[PDB]
């Protein structure tokens, strides 16, 4: 299910998380549930404003995949990636911070736009 804004990678095919591959990984497997995943990312709002980036801290963001440690769009999206891959993820609010948002950085009803690089993962 490939739209003009990317591939719908949701289980519901509700257009809530859309993915565009920017660089193919040479890795073969995706990370598994419970793996410790290492990424770099940059997040922007629909107005182009960068709200956060791991690159700006000069160390990776680390989380356990599929454990609800991150927004739903990330547990869905990162699970599709291979080592070395860079993707863009368009994350509708229902897969992110919803109607409330998370002020000051994330407004109400915000679609989030991430560029994510899967650096490594360990089981
Ligand atoms: C199970 O549901 C959730 C779990 C976690 C959650 O937010 C906290 C984790 N988080 C914040 C990180 C980092 O800022 C933590 O140091 C970051 C990267 C991973 C995705 C997402 C993110 O999911 N965010 S974020 O870039 O969207 C973000 C950055 C900033 Cl500065 C502030 C916020 Cl509120 C979000 C939000 C969740 O539901 C709304």
PDB file of C-alpha atoms in Angstrom, residues 49-102:
ATOM      1  CA  UNK A  49      10.574  23.276  12.932  1.00  0.00           C
ATOM      2  CA  UNK A  50      13.012  20.700  14.346  1.00  0.00           C
ATOM      3  CA  UNK A  51      11.637  19.692  17.758  1.00  0.00           C
ATOM      4  CA  UNK A  52      14.404  17.201  18.626  1.00  0.00           C
ATOM      5  CA  UNK A  53      17.387  15.314  17.239  1.00  0.00           C
ATOM      6  CA  UNK A  54      19.767  12.773  18.699  1.00  0.00           C
ATOM      7  CA  UNK A  55      22.470  14.087  16.329  1.00  0.00           C
ATOM      8  CA  UNK A  56      22.440  17.279  18.384  1.00  0.00           C
ATOM      9  CA  UNK A  57      23.492  15.256  21.467  1.00  0.00           C
ATOM     10  CA  UNK A  58      26.223  13.325  19.647  1.00  0.00           C
ATOM     11  CA  UNK A  59      25.097   9.949  20.924  1.00  0.00           C
ATOM     12  CA  UNK A  60      22.383   7.520  19.799  1.00  0.00           C
ATOM     13  CA  UNK A  61      18.911   7.102  21.141  1.00  0.00           C
ATOM     14  CA  UNK A  62      18.476   3.669  22.674  1.00  0.00           C
ATOM     15  CA  UNK A  63      15.253   1.829  23.473  1.00  0.00           C
ATOM     16  CA  UNK A  64      13.805  -1.681  23.733  1.00  0.00           C
ATOM     17  CA  UNK A  65      11.713  -2.464  20.663  1.00  0.00           C
ATOM     18  CA  UNK A  66       8.015  -3.256  21.012  1.00  0.00           C
ATOM     19  CA  UNK A  67       7.799  -2.475  24.725  1.00  0.00           C
ATOM     20  CA  UNK A  68       5.882   0.815  24.564  1.00  0.00           C
ATOM     21  CA  UNK A  69       8.923   2.879  25.515  1.00  0.00           C
ATOM     22  CA  UNK A  70       8.248   5.120  22.509  1.00  0.00           C
ATOM     23  CA  UNK A  71       5.274   6.393  20.524  1.00  0.00           C
ATOM     24  CA  UNK A  72       3.400   3.759  18.593  1.00  0.00           C
ATOM     25  CA  UNK A  73       4.686   5.001  15.229  1.00  0.00           C
ATOM     26  CA  UNK A  74       8.220   4.179  16.350  1.00  0.00           C
ATOM     27  CA  UNK A  75       7.488   0.661  17.633  1.00  0.00           C
ATOM     28  CA  UNK A  76       5.804   0.051  14.247  1.00  0.00           C
ATOM     29  CA  UNK A  77       8.346   1.843  12.097  1.00  0.00           C
ATOM     30  CA  UNK A  78      11.659   0.792  13.628  1.00  0.00           C
ATOM     31  CA  UNK A  79      10.468  -2.841  13.553  1.00  0.00           C
ATOM     32  CA  UNK A  80      10.527  -2.619   9.733  1.00  0.00           C
ATOM     33  CA  UNK A  81      14.093  -1.347   9.441  1.00  0.00           C
ATOM     34  CA  UNK A  82      17.421  -3.123   8.735  1.00  0.00           C
ATOM     35  CA  UNK A  83      20.859  -2.121  10.056  1.00  0.00           C
ATOM     36  CA  UNK A  84      22.172   0.792   8.027  1.00  0.00           C
ATOM     37  CA  UNK A  85      18.784   1.864   6.796  1.00  0.00           C
ATOM     38  CA  UNK A  86      17.646   5.474   6.806  1.00  0.00           C
ATOM     39  CA  UNK A  87      13.924   6.162   6.477  1.00  0.00           C
ATOM     40  CA  UNK A  88      11.450   8.974   6.753  1.00  0.00           C
ATOM     41  CA  UNK A  89       8.409   8.315   8.891  1.00  0.00           C
ATOM     42  CA  UNK A  90       5.250  10.384   8.752  1.00  0.00           C
ATOM     43  CA  UNK A  91       3.411   9.800  12.021  1.00  0.00           C
ATOM     44  CA  UNK A  92      -0.201  10.967  12.378  1.00  0.00           C
ATOM     45  CA  UNK A  93      -1.226  12.128  15.852  1.00  0.00           C
ATOM     46  CA  UNK A  94      -3.089   8.886  16.606  1.00  0.00           C
ATOM     47  CA  UNK A  95       0.324   7.109  16.436  1.00  0.00           C
ATOM     48  CA  UNK A  96       2.123   9.913  18.315  1.00  0.00           C
ATOM     49  CA  UNK A  97       0.921  12.461  20.946  1.00  0.00           C
ATOM     50  CA  UNK A  98      -2.715  12.772  19.913  1.00  0.00           C
ATOM     51  CA  UNK A  99      -5.005  15.697  20.676  1.00  0.00           C
ATOM     52  CA  UNK A 100      -3.092  16.677  23.844  1.00  0.00           C
ATOM     53  CA  UNK A 101       0.338  16.858  22.264  1.00  0.00           C
ATOM     54  CA  UNK A 102       3.284  17.311  24.634  1.00  0.00           C
TER      55      UNK A 102
END
